Amino acid sequence: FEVAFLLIQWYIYGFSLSAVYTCKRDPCPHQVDCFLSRPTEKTIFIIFMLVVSLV
Ligand X SMILES: CCCCCCCCCCCCCC
By the criterion CB under 6 A, which residues form the site for ligand X? 1, 4, 15-16, 40, 43-44, 47-48, 51, 54-55
Which of the choices ligand X, its own copies, none does residue 31 contact, using the CB cut-off of 5 to 8 A by kind?
its own copies
Determine the 3-state secondary structure of 34 from DSSP. strand
Provide the terminal-to-terminal Cα distance of the chain, rounded to the nearest Å: 14
User: Considering beta carbons, is residue 8 or 32 the nearer one to its own copies?
Assistant: 32
Q: Residues with Cβ < 8 Å from 3, sequence gap 6 or more?
A: none
Which of the choices its own copies, ligand X, none does residue 29 contact, using the CB cut-off of 5 to 8 A by kind?
its own copies
